[PDB]
Amino acid sequence: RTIKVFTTVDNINLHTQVVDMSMTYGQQFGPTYLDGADVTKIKPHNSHEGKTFYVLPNDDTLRVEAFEYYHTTDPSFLGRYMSALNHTKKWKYPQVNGLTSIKWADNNCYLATALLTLQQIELKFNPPALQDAYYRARAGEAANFCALILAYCNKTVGELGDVRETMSYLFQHANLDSCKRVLNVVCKTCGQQQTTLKGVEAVMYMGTLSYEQFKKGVQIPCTCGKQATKYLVQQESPFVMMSAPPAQYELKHGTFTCASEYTGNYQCGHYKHITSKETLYCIDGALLTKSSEYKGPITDVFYKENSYTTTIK
Ligand SMILES: O=C(Nc1cccc2ccccc12)c1cccnc1
Numbered sequence: 001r002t003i004k005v006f007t008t009v010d011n012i013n014l015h016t017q018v019v020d021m022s023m024t025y026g027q028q029f030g031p032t033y034l035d036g037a038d039v040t041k042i043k044p045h046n047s048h049e050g051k052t053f054y055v056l057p058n059d060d061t062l063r064v065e066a067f068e069y070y071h072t073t074d075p076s077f078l079g080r081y082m083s084a085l086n087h088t089k090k091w092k093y094p095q096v097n098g099l100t101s102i103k104w105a106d107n108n109c110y111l112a113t114a115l116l117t118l119q120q121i122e123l124k125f126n127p128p129a130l131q132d133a134y135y136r137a138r139a140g141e142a143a144n145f146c147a148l149i150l151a152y153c154n155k156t157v158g159e160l161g162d163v164r165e166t167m168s169y170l171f172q173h174a175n176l177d178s179c180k181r182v183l184n185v186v187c188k189t190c191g192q193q194q195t196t197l198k199g200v201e202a203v204m205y206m207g208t209l210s211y212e213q214f215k216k217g218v219q220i221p222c223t224c225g226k227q228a229t230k231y232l233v234q235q236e237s238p239f240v241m242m243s244a245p246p247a248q249y250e251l252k253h254g255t256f257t258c259a260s261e262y263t264g265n266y267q268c269g270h271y272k273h274i275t276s277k278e279t280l281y282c283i284d285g286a287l288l289t290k291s292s293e294y295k296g297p298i299t300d301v302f303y304k305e306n307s308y309t310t311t312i313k
Pocket residue numbers: 160161162163244245246262265266267268269299
């Protein structure tokens with residue numbers, strides 16, 4: 001007694017299977033999922049005929065398909081993706097000021113601000129999984145994209161992540177190869193030291209939120225025990241992300257693209273998103289407020305860029 005089903009790792013390439021309806025999916029395929037639901041311990045029902053089940057990439061055909069689609073060989077990746085999807089499928093993705101947001105659930109505030117940020121910066125993903133899911137998220141169906149971020153970042157639904165760390169992981173899977181940064185560190189004692197950064201390290205800085213201050217210079221520790229000055233010589237990138245420990249900061253309309261605000265304590269706080277459009281909009285999941293001025297505990301600010309060369313000699 002049998003039905004026909006299809007197994008997959010990428011939901012595109014299907015593998016015809018004939019399953020014994022007296023045995024679990026588990027006994028025939030190993031761990032098995034139906035649109036995120038774990039059916040490993042369940043026996044085939046007739047309503048399953050012709051349906052697609054996810055399985056683990058446990059032969060060379062599935063390994064090649066999984067790597068080509070996801071760009072990861074982490075063995076627990078597919079199970080993490082399916083477990084998250086089972087939750088993200090039931091989140092709400094309301095359109096807020098023309099952007100896909102996420103209604104608050106399960107500490108997902110860091111994800112909502114990350115998703116809102118992506119839709120305001122020029123970025124293309126390398127893994128087809130992220131390309132296809134990000135296209136759907138932009139159209140309003142973000143369940144797959146959210147599940148993939150959770151899986152790539154090794155975060156479970158319910159865990160509060162850091163926005164900067166999350167953007168860092170997503171940038172590693174994006175085409176930032178054109179991006180270039182040149183830095184100069186001046187110590188009165190020790191003189192000068194020029195650094196070039198490439199890719200992800202060229203678009204991220206930790207220590208100040210102000211793109212203008214980065215250009216004029218910021219004080220950092222030197223090994224000699226003095227304070228050295230670091231400023232921006234040259235930048236080629238479509239955006240920059242300036243990050244700092246959360247601290248009261250004033251966001252001025254028209255001077256930035258968007259920003260992330262973090263309120264509260266370590267691992268038990270809340271992120272909000274601020275976008276600079278015709279005014280300052282504060283997007284907090286499904287919630288929207290406006291103001292002409294904004295002050296809060298800002299962690300990250302995104303700025304547009306193309307090409308910058310310092311006048312500092
Ligand atoms: O401390 C946080 N984020 C961070 C911001 C800036 C610098 C940090 C340095 C080390 C660890 C966390 C940092 C944090 C804690 C809980 C939830 N989300 C974020």
